[PDB]
Ligand binder design. Sequence first.
Ligand SMILES: C[S@@+](CC[C@H](N)C(=O)[O-])C[C@H]1O[C@@H](n2cnc3c(N)ncnc32)[C@H](O)[C@@H]1O
Length: 281
Amino acid sequence: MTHVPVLYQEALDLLAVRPGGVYVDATLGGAGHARGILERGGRVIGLDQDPEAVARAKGLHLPGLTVVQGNFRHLKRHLAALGVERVDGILADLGVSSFHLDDPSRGFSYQKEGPLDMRMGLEGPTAKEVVNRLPLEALARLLRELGEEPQAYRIARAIVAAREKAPIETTTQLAEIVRKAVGFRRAGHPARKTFQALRIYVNDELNALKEFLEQAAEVLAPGGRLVVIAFHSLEDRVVKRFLRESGLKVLTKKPLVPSEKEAAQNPRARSAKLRAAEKEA
Ligand SMILES: C[S@@+](CC[C@H](N)C(=O)[O-])C[C@H]1O[C@@H](n2cnc3c(N)ncnc32)[C@H](O)[C@@H]1O
């Protein structure tokens, strides 16, 4: 009915906020976690590429919060433009915003009709252009690599068959095309993996993440904490590998996961994996 930010206390405790400190909330969203950092006395530089989240966040007029519209893969550059080279802590709660999920017009849901857009921000071609133009081979690779889709070729072929008939324009048309090609699927609706892959591709999520992570490690002041909450297999693996290969002190050998109570209350929270590391010296 409101939804407490995922792993709120765990994330904040790991950030070890101290009054006067400066923290980066790299995925501001509705500012749920940011509010917690402000409450603990830290200042927050919050980034978000979704124009609707940026507008909303600013409309909250929270003292101590600086909102930056932009992609976290430009973190170092944007902090430098605010006159900041080091920060005390960094948080990233990955995924789409409330608007992305509750506003069918953004085209993120295979269940709610809307145009195939899927861009969290305003950068690059839409999912519509990707599904109507990528050659079969490229399409299948995208589904396989970014969606871990076992029936990548079969789905890609169905998408090509349909688009050669008429442009694929809506989430529900794409979802039905994938559903007809796959049929029953135990794990989740047959269109889920395809939608996830297209979302990752359209937003170049994995590379943006890898770039943000290395810049985050660099700008952390001594003893500062990098805290990331991952929600799907591919991004959690990127976070896990980065942290262990980074040289940072890994604080969470195993990811922190929400209690069944939190999982019960907030479904989105069920696949959450929180990992953190510390900058030393
Ligand atoms: C799960 S929501 C954040 C919810 C937030 N923790 C709260 O408590 O309200 C993630 C936000 O990250 C943003 N986001 C995702 N990838 C991004 C990127 N590469 N650069 C900037 N913002 C990004 C989205 O637009 C979305 O608003």
